[PDB]
Paper text:
Hypusination is a unique post-translational modification of the eukaryotic translation factor 5A (eIF5A) that is essential for overcoming ribosome stalling at polyproline sequence stretches. The initial step of hypusination, the formation of deoxyhypusine, is catalyzed by deoxyhypusine synthase (DHS), however, the molecular details of the DHS-mediated reaction remained elusive. DHS catalyzes the transfer of the 4-aminobutyl moiety from SPD to the modifiable lysine (Lys50) of eIF5A in a NAD-dependent manner. Recently, patient-derived variants of DHS and eIF5A have been linked to rare neurodevelopmental disorders.
To understand how the binding of eIF5A and DHS facilitates the deoxyhypusination reaction, we used single-particle cryo-EM to determine the structure of the human eIF5A-1-DHS complex at an overall resolution of 2.8 Å. We reconstituted and trapped the complex using individually purified components, namely eIF5A-1 and the catalytically dead variant DHSK329A (we refer to the complex as eIF5A-DHSK329A). The complex structure is composed of a single eIF5A monomer bound to a DHS tetramer. The binding interface is located between two DHS protomers, which almost equally contribute to eIF5A binding (interaction surface with chain A 489.6 Å2 and chain B 564.2 Å2) and can be explained by DHS active site complementation. Overall the eIF5A interface constitutes a large surface area of ∼1054 Å2, which covers approximately 12% of the total surface of eIF5A25. This interaction is mediated mainly by a 3-stranded β-sheet formed by the N-terminal domain of eIF5A. The highly conserved hypusination loop of eIF5A (46SKTGKHGHA26) enters the DHS active site through a distinct tunnel and is stabilized mainly by three helices at the DHS dimer interface. The hypusination loop thereby unlocks the entrance to the active site by displacing the ball motif. Finally, we observe that NAD binds to all four DHS active sites, while the SPD moiety binds to three—all but the one occupied by eIF5A. Interestingly, we observed that the indole ring of Trp327 is shifted perpendicularly in the complex, relative to its position in DHSwt. The cryo-EM structure clearly indicates that the wild-type position of Trp327 overlaps with that of the modifiable Lys50 residue of eIF5A in the complex.
Numbering used by the authors:
A (entry chain D): 28 to 78, 83 to 363
B (entry chain E): 15 to 150
C (entry chain B): 8 to 78, 83 to 363
D (entry chain A): 8 to 363
E (entry chain C): 10 to 78, 83 to 363
The structure:
């Protein structure tokens, strides 16, 4: 009962009206508008006031009316979207962070050396003899990884010292918080995450340059242990003891299923927004439609999940500019 | 009377219909229903009862076409007088206004009587034409 | 100690990049929501946002080249349109007319911002139908068996009632009768472009693309006009009034002549298919186009022409060697209104 | 001690599936390499192999339906149809795109046209010119990653990972101009109305090569339909020929009548489409006149998230009457080069004897 | 104008004689399956890629069969080394389908060396030994399946009772793994746990039973993302103390690749498996052979859609190699690849 109408440019150039007009334009613009509505519903639910289980949940962060999970992939940190995600972590707009190994270290490396633009068609050989690594259409000099080892080794030495002298049991979340404390840069995501008591989870932290650094470091000062069983209870109890949950996942892979499995323990989530470019014809979990997660209890049967088939680097800044940026005052 | 309207959505196979001003018998019928072409339409293929030509036409499913009225009679043709077709009409008169079917088929009726074969001559009456074609 | 080969492989020495390289930098919202500045950060953000920014720059270059005053007309061509400093081809698919993008393309046609239009058969039928009945919103997951029983046709996530096609027929049959007659008495030779211009004249609605196309003398080309509902309605009408002829060779001459006698050419294509190849073949006559922007979602791994990169057109001469075409891998309904809001809407009063 | 509610979600009670449920099995290589069994095992392997098996079953059903003898007492309208081809129990439409002729699939399509296994052919403008050119010059292999500047300097055109020299197109003009001259002469001196299908049928008689698809198509009286025939190399040749001998006219209204009547007067219809574009919608529009098709098989690599027609699922065509409600259409999400030879190796090849 | 004729018609150069022509398979000779699959190399777009992959795998197989003539102390492994070490990586959904039978054939006959998978690909193989998997459709609705307790994976259906039989099998085992940790000083890693589970399943149809019987290491960096994580979470409430260390497996997989004469890679899909194997091979300056089979694209900058040429940029593959990627669903092309390679050489793997 809703007609199809575009935006008439004879009225001028009004950006708010132009972004509102996507709800009735067509194929993926309708999905973008529905995603905007879902995120707005999340935001309005969160701001409602409550009327005590810090011991059970092992969390010193205070409780709210809606717990938000934010998951992202590694290649979105090498882009400018890093400057958007940080904006949400700086002002306590989210509750749980989920990422991969490569999505962590590239945030620290960016605090020491920059990244440049390139092209998709560059040959790999000449890039190899010149010591330049390619990520999509971005170029990273190899010299940036020589800065990371020098900054990283003493931290590992201190961690090994504290494991034996003080009986400290290390898990990926604790290691990420420790690394975020040491960088001491206000432009980093994980500095603000640890300053605001926001847990970050990464089940596979050894798949990246951190793994190589640990492997080389273990030949001199061995004994580092990273447990993952302890890190699973935390993320499960975050979802179990929540009044309401919402999910925002950019991409797919480990983080998508890891958030969905945690939300399964409370019989599903109440809101969900997906932004990725995967297709479901090969039976992969990455490309699964949101209606498949309803089948095995990851999403509630009465919810209205939305998926947008687009690149996140084009959609996420527009989504944030329409939902979170308009409620800046209420988050003070 | 000799011609009456009828909705061509209600026609059936082996009926009769006026196709391009000809009393044709329907041999094929189909319906395209309603969709992207605009309306339900009927495709009719018919064979003439006198000549034998094939006609084709297309109906909108709601409008009307004319169905003719055909009268079936079998006349008394017993005996050949003076070499002509002495039709023994029950009207009390004799006339040769009815000609033979064009070709050698019309010759097939007169020459078989000398061979001792009876024929049930049938004269077909149409909406506007008086010609004898049907033989049985 | 750790093996030396592993350390020599993991940790090499790089070579410093020239200072001409641009750094990756996004947009921070601590400065507020400035919409003009937010859309300029796309050029330095990431993967496809950079392509969007380069497309903006290419279209701006087209527009700036067009407005330079012209210093003759070669009016031998069957064209009543004067010659400018740059001729622009705009090509689009049929599914983009059924959406709201119809209201954007029309904005460019009403204000004489483009020169040649290329589309398919559906892109005319749906535009003419939308002036008689509206189109609604649906879902991708609706089942066809229950949709057919209620007389509703699906296009993506859009719904069209059957009755919308009942009105169009009623509006089209009287026109066709007047087109066969002129074919017999006045000796008029019909081509798809002439028929589209006639339909645009007949619709008489300021919200229609082709009404403004015919009012501003903008040619519209469509090599395959019989693939759709228009062809279906022509097929049924020929049972009462046979003898309709549509010729496709004069259209080829007309479109190929536009590129030959052009000072400069540019192309804007949304999607792929026959509209992309037809424009590329037209521009091959002048050894290639000077500017080009592509927006489609196809991929090249199957060898199709739709999924072809802009680099193949250089190989067979459709695009000049010394040009920089740009392609954006995105849905047009999300990036075309944003592209227009930064290039054509800004230079609005200069097209009077 | 775990929370009770959380234990009610992971360990949810289930139901029992109906007994007519197929399990999942692969092919065991311990028995050796048996190719027929290996290919039959695709029906239970998984995601896309199941679609491949279902497509095989659909094509086999088509073939079984076609071979049924007619009563041979029917009128079999030939004057209303304008066809010299006798009618069978099932009419088959075969549609394909341009790039599939530049590859080896051309030797797979011709095998079906040489032996009277299909009824109607639908393609694009490139699919005719490439097939005719292949009878004069050959085509070579290449790479997907090749710079266009160097290729253009040396005059070699790229189609995916295939290379075509320019001299292949120089041979086409010399062979093509006299035929066009004769066509224009016959248009005026003998009163002949030209349509794309008639022109395609004319060019297959001139190549006179048993390795050509359209030679066997015209030899067996198989119609080939192409709405946009001016989009390709042949269009440029006609454009340049028009400057010396103007007057050539191609009409596209008669081909529409021919292709629609081919489907109106059919006992049963089936569709096999490789790719998308104008051929897919053209065949669907032709089948709309008879209220849909009975069997259908799609093979292309297009997705539907952008509201396109090429990526449309077979269930969308049911909504507007292109496919019947009680049919079982199948789509395979795979490249046609890898799949079509395997589909023909199982159907149309095990029944070679029955088609003679 | 003559300029247009200078654009459509141009002079060209002669191609080198070492150029292969395009030619398909002729069906007038009958259906010869061995020659039909050989004609893919000169057929077209992706069939050429299939032929190149066949050649690459055959090169790997021939290299592996060359006899040697070696230090287990550094590698800490019992498996003897050959002239070529092969890594095989796969995703979770490929074990839920019929490709699970093709992998076991290679594992059963010592045709590969290292296995890399995800958490789901380990639990699905063990669950399949207790209950079967059925066939469904891609378009089945969610809440209707949820009410009947059926989980959908692509077009495959799994009842929840399967997970109720798995838990019963798993809880007694986990208890023991705690005891040995507190008494015998056992330090558990995911690979050791996978080996123990494969030994316990004791079914000749299982991949990991043959993997542990032939001393083939299996690696999974994230073992807590799936059903195993859920069972461990529920078990830790009454028997707490289980610890899984991931650093030692990182050491083991790297030392498996450093001390090798030659390396080959076969990866089915993308994700963490591809990057994990590539990072393992980076420590020897690259791999000699590589074959990829996945359906991901590169326009979004993802690692899964990365071309094989991008791995050359950061030293994952050698410069002088010829990597191949096939853009197709693995369930259609992996059995055909094993029909031409690893199967014609059966007699040489006794
Ligand atoms: N509603 C309809 O789609 C419709 C209606 C009537 C007739 N037809 C007939 O369909 C045939 C095919 O038409 P076509 O070639 O224009 O369409 P198509 O869907 O066959 O091909 C469109 C091409 O552009 C791409 N594309 C489609 N939508 C896009 C989008 N929103 N953004 C970016 N790329 C996009 C596709 O992937 C493909 O490469 C024509 O003969 C036409 O007359 C279509
Ligand atoms: N070599 C050429 O491609 C060539 C040559 C001359 C002219 N042309 C012109 O190009 C235009 C477009 O050609 P088209 O409409 O036939 O197709 P296309 O190239 O536009 O492809 C349309 C769709 O077909 C499907 N497809 C293509 N190749 C496939 C494959 N190998 N396997 C599976 N699916 C596949 C995809 O969905 C694709 O988006 C036409 O106007 C044609 O005349 C092409
Ligand atoms: N049944 C399941 O899928 C299942 C079950 C339990 C847990 N999980 C968890 O899901 C997470 C994500 O799974 P993943 O990372 O192993 O892979 P994934 O499902 O994210 O797929 C990754 C990529 O593999 C490729 N791919 C997938 N299927 C393919 C096929 N048939 N042919 C070719 N290429 C194909 C595609 O490029 C795809 O994008 C894992 O952490 C896993 O433990 C999955
Ligand atoms: N720069 C890097 O990417 C990098 C660096 C070092 C290590 N790694 C390691 O790579 C491993 C595997 O990669 P991953 O799973 O983290 O990421 P990935 O890029 O491989 O994930 C691919 C999935 O995310 C989707 N996706 C990715 N980018 C997208 C985008 N911009 N828009 C939309 N969808 C998008 C894909 O479509 C697919 O579903 C991780 O364990 C990581 O630590 C990556």
């Amino acid at each position: 009962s809703t007609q199809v109408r575009g935006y008439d440019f004879n009225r001028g150039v009004n950006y708010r009206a132009l972004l509102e007009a996507f709800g009735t334009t067509g194929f993926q613009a309708t999905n973008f508008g529905r995603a905007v509505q879902q995120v707005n519903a999340m935001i309005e639910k969160k701001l409602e006031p409550l009327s005590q289980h810090a011991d059970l949940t092992q969390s010193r962060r205070p409780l709210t009316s809606c717990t938000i999970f934010l998951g992202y992939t590694s290649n979105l940190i090498s882009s400018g979207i890093r400057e958007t995600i940080r904006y949400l972590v700086q002002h306590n707009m989210v509750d749980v962070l989920v990422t991969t190994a490569g999505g962590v270290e590239e945030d620290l490396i960016k605090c020491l050396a920059p990244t440049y633009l390139g092209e998709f068609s560059l040959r790999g050989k000449e890039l190899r003899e010149n010591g330049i690594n390619r990520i999509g259409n971005l170029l990273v000099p190899n010299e940036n990884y020589c800065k990371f080892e020098d900054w990283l080794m003493p931290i590992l030495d201190q961690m090994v010292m504290e494991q034996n002298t003080e009986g400290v049991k290390w898990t990926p979340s604790k290691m990420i918080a420790r690394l975020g404390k040491e960088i001491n840069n206000p432009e980093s995501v994980y500095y603000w995450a640890q300053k605001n008591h926001i847990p970050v989870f990464s089940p596979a932290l050894t798949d990246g340059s951190l793994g190589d650094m640990i492997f080389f470091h273990s030949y001199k000062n061995p004994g580092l242990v990273l447990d993952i069983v302890e890190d699973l209870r935390l993320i499960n109890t975050q979802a179990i003891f929540a009044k309401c949950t919402g999910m925002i996942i950019l991409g797919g892979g480990v983080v998508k299923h890891h958030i969905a499995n945690a939300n399964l323990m409370r019989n599903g989530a109440d809101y969900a927004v997906y932004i990725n470019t995967a297709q479901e014809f090969d039976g992969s979990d990455s490309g699964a439609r949101p209606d498949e997660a309803v089948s095995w209890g990851a999403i509630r049967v009465d919810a209205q999940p939305v998926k947008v088939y687009a690149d996140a680097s084009l959609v996420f800044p527009l989504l944030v500019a329409e939902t979170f940026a308009q409620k800046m005052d209420a988050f003070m | 009377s000799a011609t009456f309207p009828m909705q061509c959505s209600a026609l059936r196979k082996n009926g009769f219909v006026v196709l391009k001003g000809r009393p044709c018998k329907i041999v094929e019928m189909s319906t395209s229903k309603t969709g992207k072409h605009g309306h339900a339409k009927v495709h009719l293929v018919g064979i003439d009862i006198f000549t034998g030509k094939k006609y084709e036409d297309i109906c909108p499913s709601t409008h009307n076409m004319d169905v003719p009225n055909i009268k079936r009679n079998d006349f008394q043709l017993i005996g050949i007088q003076d070499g002509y077709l002495s039709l023994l009409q029950d009207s009390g008169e004799v006339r040769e206004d009815l000609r033979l079917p064009e070709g050698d088929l019309g010759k097939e009726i007169e020459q078989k009587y000398d061979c001792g074969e009876e024929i049930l001559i049938t004269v077909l009456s149409a909406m506007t034409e008086e010609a004898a074609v049907a033989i049985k």
